[PDB]
Amino acid sequence: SPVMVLENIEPEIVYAGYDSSKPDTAENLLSTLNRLAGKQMIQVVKWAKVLPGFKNLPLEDQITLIQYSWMCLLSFALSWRSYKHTNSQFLYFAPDLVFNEEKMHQSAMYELCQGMHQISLQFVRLQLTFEEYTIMKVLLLLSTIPKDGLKSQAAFEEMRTNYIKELRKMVTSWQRFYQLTKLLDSMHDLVSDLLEFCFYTFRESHALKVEFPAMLVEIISDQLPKVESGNAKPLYFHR
Ligand SMILES: C[C@]12CC[C@H]3[C@@H](CCC4=CC(=O)CC[C@@]43C)[C@@H]1CC[C@@H]2C(=O)CO
């Protein structure tokens, strides 16, 4: 049943809010992009809190998972918007913020922009259906746990596996499932890339003149303060 509920809960529109006009170099794209991230998060939490099964684990587990997987979320989402609106032609961050080989170019991010684009590209080729995306997206929320587990760990695995079963239910064949689960797996590869960059732009804020809101502040100072190592255990799907 969930799928139905997911269409409903599937977050809406979010504006980045960039007073575009004068030269927009690194110090410009990133502070607005971060700002953008800060607003979508308020949206992701609103989304997750009604999710089937997930809304059932105590508030502690819920927030942890959102933290260890926030980057996957937003990035996976960027791909879908880029794919739904521009046919993947571009990276649709926000209605008021679209990227062309020029924005990616002078965003000081061209390389990661290309990676997130390579994802949207896989969406087109596979011609992803909302159903698939919505379920895959829950799988990303449920894809990176604390190396040592969760309080409601047992309840957690049954849940995720159920969503697995659901995605395969949706896939109804085994090749499709496979392509989709392999896509999500690869995501773990991109996200680690996006995170190390986000982290060093964090640690080197003022000096690079790249600001972060406050919402994203309390999250990164929490996410990478010690996990820049390997206490963040992603849960792949294949080998
Ligand atoms: C965190 C980040 C700015 C904000 C974006 C993130 C990439 C994924 C993403 C996709 C979206 O659809 C909205 C903003 C955002 C969440 C970037 C990767 C590096 C960059 C920085 O490191 C900024 O200094």
Swiss-Prot record:
Outcome of swapping residue 198 to S:
Abolishes steroid binding and transcription transactivation
Task: Enumerate the residues binding 21-hydroxyprogesterone.
Answer: 34, 40, 81, 201
| Isomerase in keyword set | no
Where does the UniProt entry say this protein principally localizes?
Answer: cytoplasm
Gene Ontology MF annotations: DNA-binding transcription factor activity; DNA-binding transcription factor activity, RNA polymerase II-specific; estrogen response element binding; nuclear receptor activity; nuclear steroid receptor activity; sequence-specific double-stranded DNA binding; steroid binding; TBP-class protein binding
What residue spans carry the region label Important for coactivator binding?
46-49
Subcellular location(s) per record: Cytoplasm; Nucleus; Endoplasmic reticulum membrane
Q: Name one GO biological process term.
A: regulation of transcription by RNA polymerase II
On assembly, the entry states: Heteromultimeric cytoplasmic complex with HSP90, HSP70, and FKBP4, in the absence of ligand. After ligand binding, it translocates to the nucleus and binds to DNA as a homodimer and as a heterodimer with NR3C1. May interact with HSD11B2 in the absence of ligand. Binds the coactivators NCOA1, NCOA2, TIF1 and NRIP1.
Homology family: Belongs to the nuclear hormone receptor family. NR3 subfamily.
**Notes concerning its domains:** Composed of three domains: a modulating N-terminal domain, a DNA-binding domain and a C-terminal ligand-binding domain.
**Clinical condition linked:** Pseudohypoaldosteronism 1, autosomal dominant: A salt wasting disease resulting from target organ unresponsiveness to mineralocorticoids. PHA1A is a mild form characterized by target organ defects confined to kidney. Patients may present with neonatal renal salt wasting with hyperkalaemic acidosis despite high aldosterone levels. These patients improve with age and usually become asymptomatic without treatment. Early-onset hypertension with severe exacerbation in pregnancy: Inheritance is autosomal dominant. The disease is characterized by the onset of severe hypertension before the age of 20, and by suppression of aldosterone secretion.
Instruction: Write down what this protein is called.
Output: Mineralocorticoid receptor
Lineage of producing organism: Eukaryota, Metazoa, Chordata, Craniata, Vertebrata
Mapped onto the parent protein, the portion here is 737 to 983 of 984
